[PDB]
């Protein structure tokens, strides 16, 4: 064995042609050893003697890709001080670019004996842990330009890697549920058919199946439990896990880009799968516990603003570095187009408060590689002062939780005031105008992975997560949902016509709103989870997508509605409306036909709207200063539980181009052409859009 | 004119091929405009309407390099709230790649009327201000190999651009004092002959001549008062200022890099040339004053932890972005090999205290472009708790001012210096071992740009800065210097021999000490500033270097040859610290008596003589390929006594390789062989080195 001192950069194992340079960090490690696993277990351990700025490194010539390796950190095991170092635990490389194997859940991976979490577990973690793998970084991106799709053209399709394709009757069994199947021409074509411009891939950072989930029959399905912020999840890899999963992902990206679809993956930097103090010792708890994790006062115990065991120290540089070194890795090495942060408020907690001047934001705001990709956030967490919708720095885009809630309530029949829903159509002027942002700062969505799918949104009052093994105690207890007549599947055509048409209203409201809509995967086919509103553990047919007449008219409804937003730049505006000076650009009307005053705006019980969107008055430039022209539209909302009669504003004509009411799809089909003062009766819980050419 | 919305990245005027894209930041600007200057002083104004996260921008097709431009920001003038925006002033671009012309000091560039600080100046600053210029970023750096000289090989040579070459009887008059003159083969030849491996360039960031200094007959010479952290100082350019200066500096880097010399820029990010209030509104004060500068708890006034007017807000990311956008720019666009930071404690002041976890340090530690270039700091600033020698994060290097003070005290004969002298030779084990650093974290230096030059350090007891006009009140008041028998130029052969040989002791101790040495420019020819110890404003014979035409060349071949002995022998540049004890002896301290010292005779009050044995076979360090570093064993003999002490050699034979005392110069001239037990009368204030393998 030949060991050269190597270099401290870049962190992790990098293959310099001849051999591999390993660089691991621990500022509280007396000794660190690099273990070279063989095909028969059997470490070949090497001490990384060279410590430079607390990074221990060496260059081992002859070591090549596919080499299974890990670290053994000889340090003090003193939970009283917060150090849980253990040289009996084969730690992963946090910067591992490909991790092989799965966690063999037992007494050996934990670092404490199963009865005394105060003591030391001198059991070898090697045969039961994940192994980091050396990776040959070569990949030939040919013509691979990043499709820098402008923000006001985006249609984000939230989809899971395994759930999108496992039930596709078009891919071989080998590709069903993996990255390569996501790159099949039958799947990319379907998103092309749907019109989406950015694929939001639920976490692909390799995660661990929770021990509590595994010793219950279930497994971690969503994967918001990552351990390697640099390695694709080896379970979504058909080509193998010895560094071939990073090949699948890179090729699945270039195949998506070859059709013009952006890859915005889901990142979970707020917590690790090592969980709380009762979790395993896999990667970081064994490297340097107090410099990676937000230790609670009384270091033994962890603070957790994510509700999932632990949280990361967002003030230590060695964590911020690891997060950006990850974010840049997926932009430059994996060619990812954007990021969506789960529980993004946790990243802003520099000390305890949600600091929008925290080093995380300042870091992301300045770095050229990361500040240019689409930065999307779930702008809250489960800690004190967590709800931060409308507070992130202006360089960010937020999941508009105030959109999903204040629109779910509208078609729910709630007396949620019109002005609440009205600003959400305008693109949350209240939330994002004063911060210095644009309507494109609101990632509008009605459904997502959390809560009900779009069909279960109109099929269930409350959750049915008894299958999750937690006794219906997990997930949202109330989703602002309405079962439309009967909770669950019903043969009655009365509610069936209602539900599938309520589905139409949510899709029409979503594509007619301002900002950036997002669709959970399967809502084109009326995907259903049986009332399970928290499917993080259902890695089964509950959360797969059922592909192959009612599930095709709703599909061609969605396809043709996204076409309307694409064709017409009014529903995707680059600035806010103002409605009045002291040709208006937006006019609000009563179904009676007369303009709305301030009293009837704050009217207590009101459910009907008629919004005029001017097409001549998009006070915005095009790419080359061109004036953006469009047809004028006339949106007629009616959340009333009774048929309401809508009057249009006299002498000139109109063209109804949208109507939720008929079970054949009005975006798909054609419309009767209405006139100015025309009496037009509109069904209860319906929508209608006109068009003046 | 044709004005496209364009991009918000990158900040500044970036040329693309068709035209230029301009992007300026202001979160406190109701309107920003882009003034395009012609050669007849006329403006072509363009509103940069398209704000994007407070960065206003437009793409102007047809605008090409050499286009002088500026910004005018319409905003509320309200120092009571912290705003000093004034459209009357033509603001520079902080991301200026090239700034042309100089500041025409008048009553125009102040932003306030000269008699009322809280009023508003409405005088057009355009004809009196500096002009940012669009640059064509093309350069064909050919085979540029960044000479990634190791840290245990570095020899930093602090040299000014104008001082190094203005008096060279080799360069053309046009090249003297400019960037290209620095790249002349006669200059890079002298740097080669010397042994330097890195050129510390005193600030090349474009600074402003202080009005206090222009209207007093002087000028800002050192240049630690800068406005453009992206433009090279135009007054060091013999090729022009319309962007032509960036061409000089780039070619001045490839010329040095061709001869294997690193350009380690000196940067001043703590303060700006706009100073406090009562100062000019040039670049940032008019753009967004409150989010760039550390305002006081009276936003009208400016917090000043540098004693030079103002200080920057190292928490607002728009500043942090600018500092890294700048630091990255010089690395990946100007091919600069490292940065030396001015008053680098100010960069750590996130709110008031000198923070270890300052967002700046977290930012620099992580960025791959900047964390890899040589990061060196002067670790203090004039604020509370500013003295931070040995407190910067372990990735950093520091001017070890304690080395300077201790070695000056020893050769002064200060009372109890031998103890400390020993840890400053060991490489400041007290200041750097516990931090997790190496001896190379101590940039050892006796003289620098500040204080005395090496000749004045042994010729003057106190400053003679009457040239600076402040009545001998500026600069260090006691520099811990000794005049060696007469203050100023003397004819005495006694003092002259004492001084020139005292020069031989600072140079021998500096090159013999652990860590990276540092020589200020000119000390090879015995450079003299006449007793002026603060030459920030002397742009004249006082600080320019005299090139030699016997004593000024004998000292030169002493210096050049001692860099040889540090090169030829890895003991003096050890990669680790000494320990000297098992429980191989790699260091041994002996008394001139010839016996090993004890703890009582280590803290002996009256001691001025030392004999250190440096083991050459016991270099417990691996080489690039794991080679065992071998060397001859060296024996150093220090005598800071005022009289001739008799030194005894321990243990065979030894060879006198260095002797400060004889004026023939005995770094290069060989010495006799000492027995190994025999006494040797060593002269007072002399130093000797023995060699034996
Ligand atoms: N950033 C950085 N700094 C370095 C490095 N190597 C040495 N330093 C410095 O070198 C000094 C002496 O180490 P030594 O000659 O090997 O003598 C050392 C060494 O033999 C051993 N030691 C310390 N750490 C280690 C280690 O991690 N592995 C091994 N095998 N020995 C160690 O005990 C002696 C005293 O150790 P220290 O208190 O640490 O004092 C250390 C430490 O301050 C390095 O690779 N990176
Ligand atoms: N010539 C000029 N006029 C200005 C400017 N700022 C505000 N206004 C004018 O005053 C109207 C209301 O401004 P607002 O509060 O910023 O409300 C703004 C603002 O919230 C939003 N927004 C508009 N433009 C931008 C932009 O370029 N960048 C970002 N991040 N947000 C914008 O569009 C909304 C409506 O703007 P308008 O339809 O144009 O109607 C605007 C505009 O005519 C400016 O910098 N230059």
Numbering used by the authors:
A (entry chain B): 1 to 548, 553 to 586, 593 to 659, 662 to 705
B (entry chain A): 1 to 549, 553 to 586, 593 to 660, 664 to 705
Sentences from the paper on this structure:
To elucidate the molecular mechanism of c-di-GMP binding by GlgX we crystallized the S. venezuelae GlgX-c-di-GMP complex and solved the structure to 3.34 Å resolution. Strikingly, in the structure, a c-di-GMP monomer is bound at each end of an antiparallel GlgX dimer. The c-di-GMP molecules, bound at each end of the GlgX molecule, make contacts to GlgX residues 31–51 from the N-domain of one GlgX subunit and residues 430–437 and 628–638 from the Central and C-domain of the other GlgX subunit. Residues in the GlgX N-domain provide most of the base specifying contacts with the c-di-GMP. In particular, the N1 and N2 atoms of one guanine base are contacted by the side chain of Glu47 while the side chain of Arg56 makes a hydrogen bond with the O6 atom of the guanine. Cation-π interactions to this guanine base are provided by Arg31 and Arg49. There are also two hydrogen bonds from residues in the Central domain of the other subunit to this guanine base; the main chain amide nitrogen of Gly436 hydrogen bonds to the guanine N2, while the side chain of Arg438 hydrogen bonds with the O6 atom of the guanine and also stacks with the guanine base along with the side chain of Arg579. The two c-di-GMP phosphates are contacted from the side chains of Ser629 and Gln433. Specifically, c-di-GMP binding leads to a restructuring of two loops formed by residues 432–442 and 579–593 within the C-domain region bound by the second messenger. Thus, these analyses indicate that c-di-GMP binding acts as an allosteric regulator of GlgX to stabilize its active state.
